[PDB]
């Protein structure tokens, strides 16, 4: 009949057992039954945020009907998953949709109060038969709803509920709101323990139950895209397919929690991966790798090494971010170099990061540049720069440079940030900063540091510059810092080592060009004499390397003088540096 054409019996499928076991949801199914045994407006609607198991509530109710675990008034009923695409499709003629829907309604009256109706996507039922001068499904179902003589069950997302049903109050009051919350962690672990049998029967592999509880735990903590139980189910399924292809292509036979971590790190790259000996010996050689690019300035290397080790070691403060820092020193001591060193350690690249230089924000209102603009105003549909740049890749490094340049009340934003890792952009959603490192640099007591780094300890220098910082900032803000570090002007040996590093990357780029070039150490001594001052550090070394290398060497390369394969000693002139061809 017409019920055969447009409806699908879920209860016959659960009678075949071809539906999923549904475990839990007891108050939700009980209130759904309480609404379904009424006199007027029998119709519960499963308002719940997208992917918390709303279809599975009705499927589990169908299974409880088949098992006979319902009250006596529901024993022997039929749940029919109504189809909207079956009804819209065949009707470009006038009245043909209304013909079908009225025939369905007369069949449902004919079934004598035995058919439970399930309508997935109730928001699809709203704009259903919207042809020019045509009733939708609302204008035809709406009689039989509030006489109680239809046993509809809605299932809709809450954002679809606002736009598509709360806009139409008449059909909005015909139903009964059933909030279906995202489950907490422990109950989701229980549900996943229920569903282990299905995936074991599907992929013929086994699952570690610690991997299950780790998938639920890490999914609730780190992934902010989807919602429970959906994200954890997808973790388990994708791990199962990965193990199946590891076996079948070319080891193991189960699904460990390390496989869960590999799935999560493949999905984003938050380094939940366990400390393998390459990674763990890398992490124990933290300061050694930081002094592969940054000579000197030991104490901040120590502090950030400590913070990243406490992050990776499973001792993360789960609400504050990784490290809430503050760098302080005179101009040109490689503060940005240390930040690029962290980026290169973490991501194998300097500019795989976000640097936002706060000298651009010397006015107040650029707060709205990084957090966005409210509803109504100009740049609403774009988001703040900082929030979006986190919202793509949350495991990153957020760098603020020249923090003395901006207005003091930009730093209520970072009060939020360093309190909880939370930030709310102009559209009004939270952005998790629990995988970020915040570094702020200034040159506050640079006169005081250049004056008194000699003949003083590190500690009371930090004390005195902290007093200067309290003269600068707010007591709220500097409480949020994990650790304030102090930089110092470098000796000439540090600048000679930096010149060695610049010669290393120069010879790297000239082997890329294809030239075997060496240097006299006297030329290194002359370059150390040239770009040196205690007041400015190595940016004079930058310009000295720039001029006295990049001008004559590249001038003689383009002069046809430098032949590849020749030994090229960068020896000295009387006042300059000369290359040879030997």
Ligand X SMILES: Nc1ncnc2c1ncn2[C@@H]1O[C@H](COP(=O)(O)OP(=O)(O)OP(O)(O)=S)[C@@H](O)[C@H]1O
Cβ proximity of 152 and 116 under 8 Å? no
Coil vs helix vs strand at 35: helix
Percent helix, strand and coil across the chain, each to the nearest 5:
50, 10, 40
> What angle is formed at CA 82 by the lines to CA 77 and CA 86, rounded to 5 degrees?
145
Query: Cis ω on the peptide bond leading into residue 124 (within 30° of 0)?
Result: no
Discontinuities in the chain (C→N > 2.5 Å), after residue: 250
Instruction: Look at residue 281 and give the partner it binds from ligand X, ligand ADP, a second copy, none, a contact being a CB closer than 5 to 8 Å depending on partner kind.
Output: a second copy
Applying CB under 6 A, does 23 fall inside the site for ligand ADP?
yes
Applying CB under 8 A, does 110 fall inside the site for a second copy?
no
Asked whether the CA dihedral 439, 445, 449, 455 is positive or negative, the reply is negative
Of 332, 384, 394, 445, the residue at the interface with ligand X (CB under 6 A) is: 332
Closest CA to 421 of 335, 317, 500, 266: 317
In the stretch 179-198, what mask flags binding to ligand X with x, by CB under 6 A? ------------x--xx---
23: annotated binding-site residue?
Answer: yes
Strands 115-120 and 517-519: unpaired
295: annotated binding-site residue?
Answer: yes
CB closer to ligand X, 24 vs 384 = 24
Instruction: Look at residue 93 and give the partner it binds from ligand X, ligand ADP, a second copy, none, a contact being a CB closer than 5 to 8 Å depending on partner kind.
Output: a second copy
Q: Kindly state the smallest distance separating residue 385's Cβ from ligand X, in Å.
A: 22
In the stretch 418-447, what mask flags binding to ligand ADP with x, by CB under 6 A? -----------------------x------
Applying CB under 6 A, does 333 fall inside the site for ligand X?
yes
Of 47, 255, 553, 568, the residue at the interface with a second copy (CB under 8 A) is: 553
Long-range contacts of 339-345 (CB under 8 A, 24+ apart): 339/397, 339/399, 339/439, 340/293, 341/289, 341/290, 341/293, 341/294, 342/290, 342/304, 342/308, 342/397, 342/437, 342/439, 343/397, 344/293, 345/286, 345/289, 345/290
Applying CB under 8 A, does 120 fall inside the site for a second copy?
yes
Applying CB under 6 A, does 295 fall inside the site for ligand ADP?
yes
Strands 323-328 and 436-442: parallel
CB closer to ligand X, 45 vs 538 = 538
CB closer to a second copy, 136 vs 257 = 136
52: annotated binding-site residue?
Answer: yes
32: annotated binding-site residue?
Answer: no
Tell me the chain's radius of gyration from C-alpha atoms. Answer: 34
Distant-in-sequence, close-in-space partners of 450: CB < 8 Å, separation ≥ 6: 330, 489, 534, 535
Cβ proximity of 215 and 235 under 8 Å? yes
66: annotated binding-site residue?
Answer: no
Residues 50-69 that bind ligand X (CB under 6 A): 50-56
Applying CB under 8 A, does 143 fall inside the site for a second copy?
yes
384: annotated binding-site residue?
Answer: no
Applying CB under 8 A, does 520 fall inside the site for a second copy?
no
- Give 7's strand partners: 82
Of 8, 9, 12, 23, the residue at the interface with ligand X (CB under 6 A) is: 23
In the stretch 225-244, what mask flags binding to ligand X with x, by CB under 6 A? ----xx--x-----------
> What angle is formed at CA 442 by the lines to CA 438 and CA 448, rounded to 5 degrees?
135
Residues 166-185 that bind a second copy (CB under 8 A): 167-171, 173
Of 93, 169, 376, 512, the residue at the interface with ligand X (CB under 6 A) is: 169
CB closer to ligand ADP, 36 vs 495 = 495
Of 229, 383, 384, 445, the residue at the interface with ligand ADP (CB under 6 A) is: 229
Of 170, 313, 456, 554, the residue at the interface with ligand X (CB under 6 A) is: 170
List the alpha helices (DSSP H) in 325-432. 335-347, 367-371, 385-392, 413-420
Of 230, 289, 357, 561, the residue at the interface with ligand ADP (CB under 6 A) is: 230
Closest chain position to ligand X (CB): 53
Instruction: Look at residue 384 and give the partner it binds from ligand ADP, a second copy, ligand X, none, a contact being a CB closer than 5 to 8 Å depending on partner kind.
Output: a second copy
- Give 177's strand partners: 45
Q: Kindly state the smallest distance separating residue 481's Cβ from a second copy, in Å.
A: 11
Q: Which stretch binds ligand ADP (CB under 6 A): 22-30, 246-254, 298-306, 554-562?
A: 22-30
Residue reference for tokens 């903590």? 221
Applying CB under 8 A, does 30 fall inside the site for a second copy?
yes
333: annotated binding-site residue?
Answer: yes
CA distance 9 to 563: 82
92: annotated binding-site residue?
Answer: no
List the alpha helices (DSSP H) in 24-151. 26-36, 54-66, 85-88, 96-110, 122-126, 138-145
Q: Which stretch binds a second copy (CB under 8 A): 116-124, 252-260, 447-455, 527-535?
A: 116-124
Applying CB under 6 A, the site for ligand ADP has a residue count of 34
CB-count burial class (<10 Å; 0-12, 13-18, 19+) for 459: exposed
List the alpha helices (DSSP H) in 173-331. 185-194, 196-203, 209-221, 230-249, 257-267, 277-284, 286-290, 298-312
54: annotated binding-site residue?
Answer: yes
For residue 3, what is the DSSP state? Answer: H
Distant-in-sequence, close-in-space partners of 89: CB < 8 Å, separation ≥ 6: none
CB closer to a second copy, 316 vs 448 = 316
Of 295, 403, 506, 553, the residue at the interface with ligand X (CB under 6 A) is: 295
Residues forming contacts to ligand ADP in the complex (CB under 6 A) are 20-24, 48, 50-56, 191, 194, 229-230, 294-297, 331-337, 441, 498, 537-539, 542
Residues of the shown chain interacting with ligand X in the complex, contacts defined by CB under 6 A: 20, 22-25, 50-56, 120, 146, 157, 169-170, 173, 191, 194-195, 229-230, 233, 294-296, 331-337, 498, 537-539, 542
Residue stretches of the annotated binding site for ADP: 23, 51-52, 54-55, 295, 332-333, 335-337, 539, 542
Binding annotation: 23, 51-52, 54-55, 295, 332-333, 335-337, 539, 542
């Amino acid at each position: 009949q017409a019920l055969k054409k447009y409806t699908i019996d879920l209860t016959e499928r659960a009678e075949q057992g071809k539906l999923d076991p549904v475990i839990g949801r007891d108050e939700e199914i009980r209130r759904t039954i309480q609404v379904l045994q009424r006199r007027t407006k029998n119709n519960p609607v499963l308002i719940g945020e997208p992917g918390v198991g709303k279809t599975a509530i009705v499927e589990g109710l169908a299974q409880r009907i088949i098992n006979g675990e319902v009250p006596e008034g529901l024993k022997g009923r039929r749940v029919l998953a109504l189809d909207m695409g079956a009804l819209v499709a065949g009707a470009k003629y006038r009245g043909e949709f209304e013909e079908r829907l009225k025939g369905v309604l007369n069949d449902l009256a004919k079934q004598e109060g035995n058919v439970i109706l399930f309508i997935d996507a109730l928001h699809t039922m709203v704009g259903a038969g919207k042809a020019d001068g045509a009733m939708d499904a609302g204008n035809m179902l709406k009689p039989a709803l509030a006489r109680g003589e239809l046993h509809c069950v809605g299932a809709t997302t809450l954002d679809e509920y606002r736009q598509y049903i709360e806009k139409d109050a008449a059909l909005e009051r015909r139903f009964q709101k059933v909030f279906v919350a995202e489950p907490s962690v422990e109950d989701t672990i229980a549900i996943l323990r229920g569903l282990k049998e299905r995936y074991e029967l599907h992929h013929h592999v086994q699952i570690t139950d610690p991997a299950i509880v780790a998938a639920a735990t890490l999914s609730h903590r780190y992934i902010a895209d989807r919602q429970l139980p959906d994200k954890a189910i997808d973790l388990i399924d994708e791990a199962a397919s990965s193990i199946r292809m590891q076996i079948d292509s070319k080891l193991r036979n189960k699904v460990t929690d390390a496989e869960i971590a590999e799935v999560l790190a493949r999905w984003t790259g938050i380094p939940v991966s366990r400390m393998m000996e390459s990674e763990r010996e890398k992490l124990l050689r933290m300061e050694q790798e930081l002094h592969h690019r940054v000579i000197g300035q030991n104490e901040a290397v120590d502090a950030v090494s400590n913070a990243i080790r406490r992050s990776r070691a499973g001792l993360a403060d789960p609400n504050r971010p990784i490290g809430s820092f503050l760098f302080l020193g005179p101009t040109g001591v490689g503060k940005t170099e240390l930040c690029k060193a962290l980026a290169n350690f973490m991501f194998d690249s300097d500019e795989a990061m976000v640097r936002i230089d706060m000298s651009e924000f010397m006015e107040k209102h650029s707060v709205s540049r990084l957090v966005g603009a409210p509803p109504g105003y100009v740049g609403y549909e774009e988001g703040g720069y900082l929030t979006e740049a986190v919202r793509r890749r949350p495991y990153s490094v957020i760098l603020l440079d020249a923090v003395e340049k901006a207005h003091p009340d930009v730093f209520n934003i970072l009060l939020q940030v360093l309190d909880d890792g939370r930030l709310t952009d102009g559209q009004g959603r939270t952005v998790d900063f629990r995988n970020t490192v915040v570094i702020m640099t200034s040159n506050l007591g640079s006169d005081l540091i250049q004056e008194r780094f000699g003949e003083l300890d590190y500690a009371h220098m930090k004390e005195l510059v902290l007093g200067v910082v309290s003269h600068n900032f707010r007591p709220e803000f500097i409480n949020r810092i994990d650790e304030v570090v102090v930089f110092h002007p470098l000796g000439e040996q540090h600048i000679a080592s930096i010149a060695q590093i610049q010669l290393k990357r120069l010879y790297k780029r000239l082997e890329e060009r294809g030239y075997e070039i060496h240097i006299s150490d006297e030329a290194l001594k002359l370059l150390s004499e040239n770009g040196y001052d205690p007041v400015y550090g190595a940016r004079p070394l930058k310009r000295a390397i720039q001029q006295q290398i990049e001008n004559p060497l590249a001038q003689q390369i383009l002069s046809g003088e430098l032949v590849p394969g020749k030994v090229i000693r960068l020896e000295v002139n009387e006042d300059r540096i000369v290359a040879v061809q030997h």
